[PDB]
């Protein structure tokens, strides 16, 4: 329906604003663009599902997220990809892990404070009805 289309539009506007706030944070610069396979050729061979905030914007705009839960799965991937690809004790890996975890924690905290649970529930019920 048109009302359901209006619901999903509001979801996209909400998710674009959360994603923009993550992207303008200087801590999260490394997560804003896909990993250039020059600097790191083995990335795309180790990480089967690369994810970055530019890919998340593209996905929002392609109407791939019908619920905040589906968006949070892609935020979770940014964090788990970094935990998997950068697991060493050395400071370069520890810094990327801490930034990735912080991204994830930030996205969850903004959604806890700003997502209405009844809005999420509506999205979930329209999705489950398709
Ligand atoms: O990129 C921008 C910049 C501003 Br300012 C606001 C929204 N967005 C969309 C998120 O990609
Ligand atoms: Cl840095």
UniProtKB/Swiss-Prot annotation:
Belongs to the AAA ATPase family. Residues 108-130 form a coiled coil. Interacts with ESR1 and NCOA3 and these interactions are enhanced by estradiol. Interacts with acetylated lysine residues on histone H1.4, H2A, H2B and H3 (in vitro). Signal peptide: none annotated. Residues 3-114 form the Bromo domain. This is ATPase family AAA domain-containing protein 2. May be a transcriptional coactivator of the nuclear receptor ESR1 required to induce the expression of a subset of estradiol target genes, such as CCND1, MYC and E2F1. May play a role in the recruitment or occupancy of CREBBP at some ESR1 target gene promoters. May be required for histone hyperacetylation. Involved in the estrogen-induced cell proliferation and cell cycle progression of breast cancer cells. It comes from Homo sapiens. Highly expressed in estrogen receptor positive breast tumors and in osteosarcoma tumors. Induction: Up-regulated in breast, uterus, colon, ovary, and stomach tumors. Induced in breast cancer cells overexpressing NCOA3 or treated with estrogen. Down-regulated in 5-fluorouracil-resistant derivatives of the colon cancer cell line HCT 116. It is found in: Nucleus.
